[PDB]
């Protein structure tokens, strides 16, 4: 519940940075301090930014892929926790970096999407 | 990863919105602003605001669905969701705030998993 929300934040910020290439306040710089440690405070509102970010993706298929993987990420999530234990904010960070270097992998999301 | 019997009003509304947008995005797949793009912000927070209008708006999507039985498929799971929704809550609780996004993406997965809805409907 910390690692998968780290992944969720990674895909959310990737979608944002994919939607707005040049951002001054990515949802990292704006929502990370509380998505890492306090997921209900944020992930209930990151994911209202999310449909708009997916809408703004110039490749709507890329929006579908990123929304697919955030569905996959969030399938492992049954509820955003009120507070992330110190154990999981490390997971969140690890989950964030794992998923963000998965997204910035060569064809990883295109592939993983295509095997569904 | 979908608790079809969760009863968490945020989660059931997220599921409901997921199927609502599934219908909208199967009504006309070429759609500039799906209800995620125009309604989700409050559907996740103020379900009474939209979810009334989302279901003014729903039978017309069910009509626009090309496969007339697919409309029954999706309306059936709207009803399956709404059994768990005794009321659209005025403001979604913060737990429920997040569980709405959970529901949107859980039910969206359930809809985009290949046979799930067509199967699960046939066990009803």
């Amino acid at each position: 519940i910390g690692y998968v929300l780290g992944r969720l934040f990674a895909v959310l910020e990737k979608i944002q940075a994919e939607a707005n290439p040049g951002l001054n306040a990515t949802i990292a710089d704006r929502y990370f301090g509380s998505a890492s440690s306090t997921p209900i405070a944020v992930f209930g509102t990151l994911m209202r930014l999310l449909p708009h970010h997916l809408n703004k993706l110039e490749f709507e298929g890329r929006a579908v892929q990123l929304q697919w993987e955030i569905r996959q990420i969030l399938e492992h999530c049954q509820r955003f926790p009120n507070h992330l234990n110190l154990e999981q904010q490390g997971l969140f960070a690890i989950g964030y970096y794992h998923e963000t270097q998965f997204l910035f992998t060569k064809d990883a999301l295109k592939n993983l999407f295509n095997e569904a | 990863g979908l608790d079809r019997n969760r009863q968490d009003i945020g989660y059931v509304l997220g599921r409901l919105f997921a199927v609502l947008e599934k219908i909208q995005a199967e009504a006309n797949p070429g759609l500039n602003a799906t209800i995620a793009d125009r309604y989700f912000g409050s559907a996740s927070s103020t379900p009474i605001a939209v979810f009334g209008t989302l279901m003014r708006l729903l039978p017309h999507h069910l009509n626009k669905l090309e496969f007339e039985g697919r409309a029954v498929q999706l309306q059936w799971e709207i009803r399956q969701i709404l059994e768990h929704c005794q009321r659209f809550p005025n403001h979604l609780n913060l737990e429920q705030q997040g569980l709405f996004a959970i529901g949107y993406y859980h039910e969206t997965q359930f809809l985009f998993t290949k046979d799930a809805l067509k199967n699960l409907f046939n066990e009803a």
Binding site: G33, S34, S37, T38, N82 | -
Partner: protein
């Protein structure tokens, strides 16, 4: 772990730049925590330090009232929620200490999933069998 902001930079920062001077920072807070300190006032070292019964009532007052007086932006509001002292008849121990500390069992209230106040805890003492010769004197609870 609240990210507070300061609307004044401290030093001439690497970024104390044109528009605003800001040093955001962190004000971590516990939304509520019922901390259970256990304490041992041993007669044997009260003999070498001259810890008097007066110096002990001062410590009881201190424990009861020391958060009402030691306040800060950092810690906000802390309160002494109860001081159950087990005074043993001997300078030895009448009973094992932990037998007396499990005796004061503090459990979150029946069905509170997250605790917001002392009202969401239940401090049940067990003064039923300590009367062996011991005294449970309840100073805060």
């Amino acid at each position: 772990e609240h990210s507070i902001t300061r609307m004044a930079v401290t030093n001439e920062k690497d970024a104390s730049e044109t528009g605003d001077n800001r040093t955001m920072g962190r004000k971590f807070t516990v939304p509520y925590g019922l901390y259970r300190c256990h304490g041992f006032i041993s007669t044997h070292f009260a003999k070498q330090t001259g810890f008097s019964e007066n110096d002990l009532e001062l410590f009881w007052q201190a424990l009861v009232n020391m958060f009402d007086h030691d306040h800060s932006a950092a810690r906000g509001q802390m309160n002494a929620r109860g001081l159950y002292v087990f005074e043993h008849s001997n300078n030895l121990g009448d009973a094992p200490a932990d037998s007396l500390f499990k005796r004061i069992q503090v459990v979150k209230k029946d069905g509170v999933e997250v605790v917001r106040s002392f009202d969401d805890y239940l401090v049940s003492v067990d003064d039923k069998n300590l009367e062996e010769t011991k005294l449970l004197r309840k100073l805060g609870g």
